[PDB]
Amino acid sequence: AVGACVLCNSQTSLRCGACIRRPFLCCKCCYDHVISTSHKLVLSVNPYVCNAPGCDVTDVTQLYLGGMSYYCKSHKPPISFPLCANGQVFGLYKNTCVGSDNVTDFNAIATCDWTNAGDYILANTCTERLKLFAAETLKATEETFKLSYGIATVREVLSDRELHLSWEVGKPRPPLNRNYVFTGYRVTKNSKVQIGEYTFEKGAVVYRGTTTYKLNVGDYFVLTSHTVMPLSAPTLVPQEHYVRITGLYPTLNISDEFSSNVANYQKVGMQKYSTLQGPPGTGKSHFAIGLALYYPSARIVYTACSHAAVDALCEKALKYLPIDKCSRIIPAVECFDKFKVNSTLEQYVFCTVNALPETTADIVVFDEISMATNYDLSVVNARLRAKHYVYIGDPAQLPAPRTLLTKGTLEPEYFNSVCRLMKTIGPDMFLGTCRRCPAEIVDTVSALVYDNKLKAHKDKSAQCFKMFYKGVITHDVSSAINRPQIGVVREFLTRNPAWRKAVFISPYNSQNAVASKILGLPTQTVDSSQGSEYDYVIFTQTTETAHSCNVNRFNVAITRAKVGILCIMSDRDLYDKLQFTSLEIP
């Protein structure tokens, strides 16, 4: 009941009747919320409505406070004083209220459909708590506009990986790839019954098996969502550098295999938070282990948004240093049970943004912070009250798709809370680790956005592929299948012997789904190639209008290779000075 309106710094019991999150607005604050826009309904400890039987008044501007109750205008016992009067709304804290100078914060960003770029613009032009309200409202609008599409179901079953699928009544269908997991429920007569986790991309309906299934009649698959609760801890911690190396457990040996570790070790010695801007091969592979060995007993927590990217470190986090000192817990969802699972007690707790309880910790070393709003930062800073932070990440690592984009692409810097801070105050560490990624990618990628931080560490043997091509497009309701550059990729792989050991990633899974029918290259998604980076690669774009060929949405997915790459680009923007070997079409 009693929450907090903070812009006016006013405890409140009121809330707007028709709004996004039942937001909390004080007397004068609810007033200029209900006169600057149209929100003529409020909720208190009890809702304001005439109490005579059969009466109906939604409005509050004409209700009266009667005999320990509320009465109204059309049906009027008016022995009272009006509820809305004298620049205020009747409630508790009617005296200890301040008001708002910026009248149109809610009136600007809580009044639109939460999809324009102006929402995020103002969210970055906010305070910590105001931008917390912003991030929670973005999660709320994500779920509330995801719960407006259909539920897939299999009513007569066919052979697995090739079924039939009817959907729903009149609703549209969302995008097509494995972004939306079709994990619904089955109904016997009134109850919900074990179903499993599914995903629909190819349709005759070809399914990808997150598990092996024996589908029965009627089985329904759809994401059923709850609402993210309000959070009680700030996302970012204010920048305060340490007086000394007091309170640390120093070691005697110094890392040697890593050539950019000692100065950054000292930095962690007197740095409180740490974020950098890097593609694969930026210390995310070895520097975490470097800190792990350089301070043994420090409570250091790691996390990636999916377990297959936590695995990229955890696979040898138990080999480089003893097993007894790491863990991450697996809920049951694709998660890897390598470590000591169902064990809160550990030292180097690996984690996933989706789930981890809170006991205690002291040092933060968290991986990518990309595909979520301030929820990711806040849940992990609430997870532990830490003395040191390392926010490994990038505003372009896996930039959060803004659901149904309608109005352009915003500046990459404007991420949750730290990426705009990031290159306005400078990178937190001196760190570049190009021991897998070669210089052929580094040249272009660092000349574009990551200036002078990553090194041209490894040379190339003039095998990088160029072929001038414009291309033609053909789109579907939720994806697109490519004639030209797919054919050119085919007839290119028919020229070189040792090129059929690559990946076939796709902007939407439809490309590899169609290709599996006649060649059969493995399925790959642009969603998250979690901790799985390989040298030889076949990249494809099909349709690239606003999600692909705009900014560094996947310029890290252009950092594919180690000694050789393929990166198909059907536009004429990201080639300005790229010098791939010029060879003619066959």
Partner RNA sequence: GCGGUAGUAGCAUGCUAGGGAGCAG
Partner RNA sequence: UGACUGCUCCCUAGCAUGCUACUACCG
- Please tell me the distance from the alpha carbon of residue 59 to that of residue 51, in angstroms, as a whole number: 13
**Residue 230 is labelled as binding a ligand:** no
The sheet with strand 363-366 has its strands ordered as 300-301, 363-366, 388-391
Question: Which of Zn ion, RNA, another protein, none does residue 16 bind (CB under 5 to 8 Å by kind)?
Answer: Zn ion
**Residue 540 is labelled as binding a ligand:** no
**Residue 393 is labelled as binding a ligand:** no
**Residue 343 is labelled as binding a ligand:** no
Q: Are 279 and 433 in contact (CB under 8 A)?
A: no
Site string for another protein, 12-41 (x = CB under 8 A): -x----------------------------
- Backbone phi, then psi, for 216, in 5-degree steps? -110, -175
Which residue, 79 or 243, has its beta carbon nearer to RNA? Answer: 79
Helices (H), 418-509: 419-425, 439-448, 484-493
Question: Which of another protein, RNA, Zn ion, none does residue 19 bind (CB under 5 to 8 Å by kind)?
Answer: Zn ion
Which residue, 87 or 522, has its beta carbon nearer to Zn ion? Answer: 87
Q: Are 203 and 209 in contact (CB under 8 A)?
A: no
**Residue 16 is labelled as binding a ligand:** yes
Measured from each CB, the residue nearest to Zn ion is: 29
Told to check if 4 binds another protein by CB under 8 A, we report no
Q: How far is the CB of 190 from RNA (least distance, A)?
A: 21
Among 8, 276, 434, 515, contact with Zn ion (rule: CB under 5 A): 8
Q: How far is the CB of 45 from RNA (least distance, A)?
A: 16
> Please, which contacts does 452-461 make with residues 24 or more away whose CB atoms are closer than 8 Å?
453/276, 453/277, 453/278, 453/427, 454/278, 454/279, 454/281, 454/282, 458/434, 458/562, 458/563, 460/563, 460/564, 461/563, 461/564
Which residue, 66 or 99, has its beta carbon nearer to RNA? Answer: 66
Residues in contact with Zn ion, total (CB under 5 A)?
11
Residue ranges in 49-88 that form contacts with another protein under rule CB under 8 A: 52-54, 65, 68, 75, 80-81
Question: Which of Zn ion, another protein, RNA, none does residue 39 bind (CB under 5 to 8 Å by kind)?
Answer: Zn ion
**Residue 351 is labelled as binding a ligand:** no
Residues near 9 by Cβ (< 8 Å), separated by ≥ 6? 98
Among 14, 29, 486, 561, contact with Zn ion (rule: CB under 5 A): 29
CB burial of 382-406 (b: ≥16 within 10 Å; e: otherwise) equals ebbebebbbbbbbbbbbbbebeeee
Per DSSP, the chain holds a count of helices (H) and strands (E) of 12, 19
**Residue 126 is labelled as binding a ligand:** no
Q: Are 71 and 50 in contact (CB under 8 A)?
A: yes
**Residue 27 is labelled as binding a ligand:** no
Q: Tell me the residue type at 70.
A: Y
Told to check if 270 binds another protein by CB under 8 A, we report no
Q: How far is the CB of 363 from RNA (least distance, A)?
A: 50
Q: Are 426 and 251 in contact (CB under 8 A)?
A: no
**Residue 327 is labelled as binding a ligand:** no
CB burial of 319-339 (b: ≥16 within 10 Å; e: otherwise) equals eebeeebbbbbbeeeebbebb
Of 139, 133, 138, 141, give the one whose Cα is nearest residue 7: 133
**Residue 50 is labelled as binding a ligand:** yes
Q: Is the C-alpha dihedral spanning 237, 243, 246, 250 positive or negative?
A: positive
- Please tell me the distance from the alpha carbon of residue 544 to that of residue 125, in angstroms, as a whole number: 30
Which residue, 66 or 175, has its beta carbon nearer to RNA? Answer: 66
**Residue 29 is labelled as binding a ligand:** yes
Question: Which of RNA, another protein, Zn ion, none does residue 53 bind (CB under 5 to 8 Å by kind)?
Answer: another protein
Q: Report the run of H or E that residue 186 belongs to, with start and end.
A: strand 186-187
Residue ranges in 44-103 that form contacts with Zn ion under rule CB under 5 A: 50, 55, 72, 75
Q: How far is the CB of 67 from RNA (least distance, A)?
A: 3
Told to check if 513 binds Zn ion by CB under 5 A, we report no
Q: Are 353 and 380 in contact (CB under 8 A)?
A: yes
Of 323, 363, 362, give the one whose Cα is nearest residue 343: 323
- Backbone phi, then psi, for 107, in 5-degree steps? -65, -15
**Residue 281 is labelled as binding a ligand:** yes
Q: How far is the CB of 65 from another protein (least distance, A)?
A: 6
Q: Are 361 and 386 in contact (CB under 8 A)?
A: yes
Q: How far is the CB of 71 from RNA (least distance, A)?
A: 10
Told to check if 357 binds another protein by CB under 8 A, we report no
Residues near 530 by Cβ (< 8 Å), separated by ≥ 6? 304, 305, 306, 307, 308, 309, 311, 312
Question: Which of another protein, Zn ion, RNA, none does residue 326 bind (CB under 5 to 8 Å by kind)?
Answer: none
Only segment of 42-50, 425-433, 473-481, 558-566 that touches another protein (CB under 8 A): 42-50
Question: Which of Zn ion, RNA, another protein, none does residue 29 bind (CB under 5 to 8 Å by kind)?
Answer: Zn ion
- Please tell me the distance from the alpha carbon of residue 300 to that of residue 302, in angstroms, as a whole number: 7
- Please tell me the distance from the alpha carbon of residue 31 to that of residue 14, in angstroms, as a whole number: 11
Among 14, 31, 32, 39, contact with Zn ion (rule: CB under 5 A): 39
Q: Which residues bind RNA (CB under 7 A)?
A: 66-68, 79
Which residue, 129 or 483, has its beta carbon nearer to Zn ion? Answer: 129
Which residue, 76 or 490, has its beta carbon nearer to another protein? Answer: 76
Q: How far is the CB of 12 from another protein (least distance, A)?
A: 11
Q: Give the Cβ contact number of residue 53 at 10 Å.
A: 5
**Residue 55 is labelled as binding a ligand:** yes
Binding-site residues for Zn(2+) sit at 5, 8, 16, 19, 26, 29, 33, 39, 50, 55, 72, 75
Residues near Zn ion (CB under 5 A) are: 5, 8, 16, 19, 26, 29, 39, 50, 55, 72, 75
Binding-site residues for a ribonucleoside 5'-triphosphate sit at 278-285
Residues near another protein (CB under 8 A) are: 1-2, 13, 44-46, 52-54, 65, 68, 75, 80-81, 90-92, 94
